[PDB]
Design a protein around this ligand. Sequence first.
Ligand SMILES: [Cl-]
Ligand SMILES: [Cl-]
Lengths: 265, 265
Amino acid sequence: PPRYVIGYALAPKKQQSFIQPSLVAQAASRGMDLVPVDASQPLAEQGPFHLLIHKLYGDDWRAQLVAFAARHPAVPIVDPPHAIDRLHNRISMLQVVSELDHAQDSTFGIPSQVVVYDAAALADFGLLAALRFPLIAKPLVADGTAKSHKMSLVYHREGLGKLRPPLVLQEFVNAGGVIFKVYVVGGHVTCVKRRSVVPPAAFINQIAGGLRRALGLQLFNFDMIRDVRAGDRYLVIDINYFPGYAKMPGYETVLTDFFWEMVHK
Amino acid sequence: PPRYVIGYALAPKKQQSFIQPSLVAQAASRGMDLVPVDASQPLAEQGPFHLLIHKLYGDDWRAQLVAFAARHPAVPIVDPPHAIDRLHNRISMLQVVSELDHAQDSTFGIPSQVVVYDAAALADFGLLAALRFPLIAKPLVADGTAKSHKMSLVYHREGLGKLRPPLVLQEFVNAGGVIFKVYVVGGHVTCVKRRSVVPPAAFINQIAGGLRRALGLQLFNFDMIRDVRAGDRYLVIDINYFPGYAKMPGYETVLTDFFWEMVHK
Ligand SMILES: [Cl-]
Ligand SMILES: [Cl-]
């Protein structure tokens, strides 16, 4: 029978966490060879691939991925670098979340955001003094490789001024102090609690489904909070591409099942 | 001597305004043939081009532009669809403006912004009631083809609620009521007043230069206001790709000189 190459272009820290012996074995056992993409050697040179999965951020990388995609159209890229660019600026990410609102008993919003570009505005922008604390403060442009590119919590206006713009802030007072981190692989969903009353599974699936159509992304997760004013309403606060699946257990089986689905696309 | 094809892929309304007999003649007179890209026929089929200029918005168009760019690397695209995607969401546009702050007597900022994604937030988001009027209210995602995608002015909170989210708001009280619309072609700058004390020409050029490096765009304009609190400080409030050059007079000469510069790149 035939064998399926899965190319993988990942940062070393991500290789260590994601490409684990248990993944490599299960995949190999089902006829799927996870093959590392030489970073020191153009993609178009590198061996034939039945699927390309990557999490690299460059105009350089982007360029090779586009060559390849026109060179090899039938070969799925997970995910296509167009789709991934939408999540890089923390305002654009929520724009794509806003696209599907058709999805019952529960409701989903995006929280309103404030973007502060310069230290001059952080001090002087009047609107900031009408903000409730705490605040989720994220830097505006993200990736997964640059350290500073994960969310943080601000209680005093003093603490806010000690931050490095550009940044995006949202209010965190309506959240009740709880965050659910939903993980998505194609049409599969996995969900986890976290402290800093669990949404109906059919609601999470509706949203996960929505985000997937809208995002055009196979591999992402999303954070939602309950709006505790109503007891039934939920907000999507973050969307990160290709998160730490290696955290949820049995990820190997989910990801191998997904790879199989992808190489019979 | 040799002749230079300039392909042009533009919406009909833009063709009418931009591709004028005076442009076609001057360009032809200098050996440069402006040739319309058949919208009903893939780019890769269409005749050889020494330069491609376009202002079309599609995943469809984007796809053909990328084929071409890998197919024909030495052929300049004005502008490359990566560079153009940065300006499409009105928060991402200011992120790219924030990149160069090295550019004396005068200073340039980005104004802080508020993004409201859902009607639910427009009504309920507390921070909005701490906003000064008037407001510049733009819809979040823009282009140049969809009508609703140009800025507007809000005086009452009533008027704000009658708007269609998603949208981005900035404060307009520090502006003194004046807007300068700077037009840029490669390394050339042209500037115009507008009512709704003129920045030093060396300041506008510094910014225009900065925006151009940062934006990676040959064809854009930017709106700046004076921050009237100081009498010397200026804010970049909008950046639109491939604006209405056909408005500034002698645009034909600027654009033909630029085309010549581009086909000797
Ligand atoms: Cl992982
Ligand atoms: Cl025009």
